[PDB]
């Protein structure tokens, strides 16, 4: 039972949660806890030595981790999205080989893939074709996800060459240890402090022909067609949404423990028990109700993702558009609820809860930081276009 | 397929929706459409001639109707809650007889039951015990639900007698046509104008021994014990929440049709197409998202209600308290979303939409009216008490 | 003291407020009450027989009236904007003559002026030049303000002629009684039911040379230049904002009276006094605070309007742009607070308040209807463009 | 011009704002900048060598400082409240002497006064009367305001003696340097990191008879009576509110600078200029409008404070209750706007703004921390009680 294991880890990590958030840097010990749990192979099919969990289950595990630790929930969650990329645009052979390696070695996968807000011809990583059919990568991917301690790195380069392949996005899974590859200890933010999201430098990094995933530009092709690879954004976006919800629960659970044990009643109002204050009770109702709505919608969306996933290549553009719209909604609901709860929970906690030893602002800092990955306003607009005009989002990395 | 039948009725009723809201009075024709549909016996088990539908399905049907017509959705929905009251506190024999009569005759059931905000000793309807073991009812039930056109009336009387039964609530299912029973044409409100929610007068109305449902005070007993009869409030409240969600969908669908065909763009802002205005698109996004969360939570709650229902007498006080807490949340989400959408939809409709021929305010008036049945603030407080203190609601008619 | 007179009228009108809202049609009696009060000449300078009140005072009067009656508040408020149009783009001679007539005769002024969302070449009222230097008007102004019972009609025609004046907006003040002028009894809406906002037909209506206000296209010229005439939108928009605030106070005052005298406490929660319910108290807190901020902003904007007004022709485009931005803010604050309060007030009133005899939904209906005159989204955008980019709104009828 | 001097200081401090927030500890340099400005004597009457500024001006100065630095705005603002305490309950002689010392020496005043949520008999600082007519203080004041670097310390002790003075609150102004007085370097919080809000220990600290302000329990007497000393809470609370508004402007100004120079447009939506994004523009509109209303309310309340203040001892319990109600509103408006804007600003800033070198979360951390000083829910409930029941807040330290 993967969820139970996550629960186990969450208990272990909670004793160091405040300190780790304060220290920042890499959460090396905890990453190792995860590796030892066997959880890294959660979505790898059983036949290759994985758990073969479904998306709903996998998302529950993400949520557990995110509640204990935003950074870890993001690290793990993003790790999960990587390997599916193989099933999505990679060959059958690449699929057997890579899934087997990840599962057998308990590999951390890492990401130096999309530049979500740059034209391909401006991407900072070039892929220059070699005559043996591979590529060499050069430049700095400024925003990465868990490249730093990874074993297998998923990288995108752009042929910026005046090749006939010019502007093609090249996807590859290469060892992080390969010469030329330098994941920097580069990451600094007010929140998500231990997500290892700094830059990686690529210096004449060779990509072997069999390390290349699908044809040149295979991702962009899959998007335009709404073929199976277009499931990328829906998957990443739903994981993110559920990280936020996990963080919201964590903040709410922390708050209530505190309210029960440490919070003092406002005596000038004649209140004798903090847990009996009518406004404190109302606030807890409102937090819970916001989560109840957002969680239920996230679960629907997870079953929908499963259904679409199980259709394999027979999925329609409508299937994927409907799923993306659903997920856009969840992303919005989760952003708004996690921000509101993470900040709001202070009101029922009181002045003493502002002490650094509680680290109570960490839940907000975590959500506030990652929720800026891609603008929630366009998630909302995409839902509105669909409701009003029947339009589907333009498939990309974030939609 | 009961939902497809409701859809068919909804199509019929939409042509008259504006006129009927404006006229008020009883929706006699439509009530007859419902009777002829067979839908009245929707929750009567198949073995008695009913559809034997589950709760989730019955709630979808309520939703379809509520989207076309809030009053009808409430009338039908409240009708559904009545017969289960037989299975809840009635005998097995009463069960077979009454279910069979309802299903065979396509009976409308009606309600002159609880006074939700009065002490039992102040209730306006007395039940005076007769020596044959029945009772006589006297007084006026000021707030009823669909007594007016009903065939079978569910009534509560209080022994206000200085009997040894004093203060006991007596529950009975009697024919509405019985002598002494006068459902008045009494109902006036700004919304829910066709719900027939006026008073009914009782004058030396005889209740036969086999028309009495369970022991004296059987309802109050079931509440204190959290036995099966305590399922009443969760069921009624979930139905209400779903009526609101239906209305919210009705308002939203009406708005979008209008925005697509009638609305004009704000030219001073350089907008050429109303469906391309970025704030109009955002607003539609928000309405959709608010509904997405609340609908998902209502669905969960419906499955939970099914699970608890299926436990029969084996249900724990915890089963029932958890259920009621879930339902309280739904009731809050639904109220808030229906109100916001119902009023907010005008912004994307424009000035011309205010013309009485569209009846666009009817959705808001409907929700605004029924949402006051019991205070949403205590639904919210009940959720907060559970989250913060682990307390369950005190079982009653509305909690 | 014009405010004390408004208070006096408000007392008189409150006895009939419910019935008049229900009846619709013209508020003939009440319009006469206003005429007899002498209040119609409120903004006419003392030297012409007027009260010569300043803008802050005049707005307080509008607010008093709007609290008693949304339709009348709008009727009166819009009347006030009309005559200033004379000082704005009319001659000194037209000024002395017309002001004197309005004040001596206690004239109602009415409006068949701007089509806010139509290109000038599509405006339904043509002004065809006559050789004596006047014009003839033809066509139907579909949306008017208080043309129906007016004495003096402010009308715009468009030379749609292939004149050399083609596309020029011609402003005239003519007697409503002139032959050809037919203000129809045409107005139907869910709210603002007695504002007489129907159409007026023009049939070869003669406008004499000295009835023409300013040169041809004088209004459009004043906007482009941000000259004194561009003060029109800021004035009208601030009047509207204050109508809404008036309505919001009317709802809130009505609610509180009801809560104090009629509302019953929620006994299941152990509440004994409705005025002692903590959530009821909180809600009144929030309504008050929302109004407190909106009102304070309204007053500031009114003093700013005075300051700019007093500058006469020396006003800068900056003066007028800053003013419009301030007013745009008030418009938004007022719309949002009036809608929220008008609907929210039902929560603290309870189910019985839904009875048509209280007409409690009239406040919301009135705000909900007029607030759609011009889109609040662009009032918000105009404030944002100013804050972010230093841009001023493009002068027009509504900005 | 005191505001211009504050502006000058604000410029100096902005270069170090990020680093200081990150470092925490005492803002020693900046405290000295303030001392050297002469601003500490801002509210000391001219006749004693002070600036004799009015409250509206003094509040503007607090606002300027708070925009640059939340901690400093709070430190300075709280300092301002202290000396008035002399004019409030102190003697005329104490007034001349103390005002003159503060102005001539440019003293920082500090506070170890009220325990806002403790019964007097549970207060941690005892005042034991001496036969020379003074007192000795013992115990730890756990929550102080700027006691650490102060020259003049305002202290409250409670006779916990079984004296005849038992339970009396003793107010004194003593030198912080006096033996027995130990302001600790004790303060740790997620925000307001440089307010020096730790504990001070008192150890057989002598208070001389002429260092005691007013009679024993003079503060509590002034509250019950609503005499001049009851102005304490309105003053403190209005200062707090304006500190929040200052911080809200600082966040908003910082955000707009960033949006204009650093922010990148969301290209997948076809946006080419960040400052032309319609949702970014709308967000700026909403932030501005929220402040526009709260600022306008704050200024009104400042003039009302001036008016009441100028009534000297002739102020009525109504005067003071109306004031406190107004101020409660502002406190609520300011809290809500500063929290919403401080967090919301990230959405228009984008992912890169999360870098610690911008310290963008400092505005939120500052508001989030101080806004918990006393519960905003009871500020809201006190407004609601006044609106609904005509009740005035019970005068105390926070109401």
From Swiss-Prot, chains A, B, C, D:
Cofactor: FAD; NADH
Disulfide bridge partners, by residue number: none
One GO MF term attached to the UniProt entry: 3-methylbutanoyl-CoA dehydrogenase activity
Pfam family, one: Acyl-CoA_dh_M
Practical applications: Can be used to remove sulfur from polycyclic aromatic sulfur compounds found in gasoline and diesel (biodesulfurization), which are a considerable source of pollution. In addition it may be possible to engineer the operon to make specialty chemicals.
Keywords assigned by UniProt, alphabetized: Cytoplasm, Flavoprotein, FMN, Monooxygenase, Nucleotide-binding, Oxidoreductase, Plasmid
BP GO annotations: dibenzothiophene catabolic process; L-leucine catabolic process
Subcellular location(s) per record: Cytoplasm
EC category name: oxidoreductase
Catalytic activity: dibenzothiophene + 2 FMNH2 + 2 O2 = dibenzothiophene 5,5-dioxide + 2 FMN + 2 H2O + 2 H(+); dibenzothiophene + FMNH2 + O2 = dibenzothiophene 5-oxide + FMN + H2O + H(+); dibenzothiophene 5-oxide + FMNH2 + O2 = dibenzothiophene 5,5-dioxide + FMN + H2O + H(+)
InterPro entries listed in its UniProt record: Acyl-CoA_DH_C, Acyl-CoA_Oxase/DH_mid-dom, Acyl-CoA_Oxase/DH_mid-dom_sf, AcylCo_DH-like_C, AcylCoA_DH/ox_N, AcylCoA_DH/ox_N_sf, AcylCoA_DH/oxidase_NM_dom_sf, DszC
Residues annotated for FMN binding in this entry: 78, 111-116, 141-145, 264, 351-352, 373
Phenotype of gene-disrupted mutants: No detectable desulfurization activity on DBT.
Cofactor, how bound (note): Addition of FAD increases DBTO2 production in cell lysates.
EC identifiers of the protein: 1.14.14.21
A single Gene Ontology CC term: cytoplasm
Annotated spans, Lid loop: 113-124
Subunit organization: Homotetramer. Homodimer.
Domain comment in the entry: The lid loop assumes one of 2 conformations allowing opening and closing of the active site.
Family statement: Belongs to the DszC flavin monooxygenase family.
Function of the molecule: Catalyzes the first step of the '4S' desulfurization pathway that removes covalently bound sulfur from dibenzothiophene (DBT) without breaking carbon-carbon bonds. Sulfur dioxygenase which converts DBT to DBT-sulfone (DBTO2 or DBT 5,5-dioxide) in a stepwise manner. In DBTO (dibenzothiophene-5-oxide) was reported not to be a substrate, in it is reported to be a substrate. Can also use benzyl sulfide and benzyl sulfoxide as substrates, although benzyl sulfoxide is a poor substrate.
UniProt name for this protein: Dibenzothiophene monooxygenase
Source organism of this protein record: Rhodococcus qingshengii
Phylogenetic lineage: Bacteria, Bacillati, Actinomycetota, Actinomycetes, Mycobacteriales
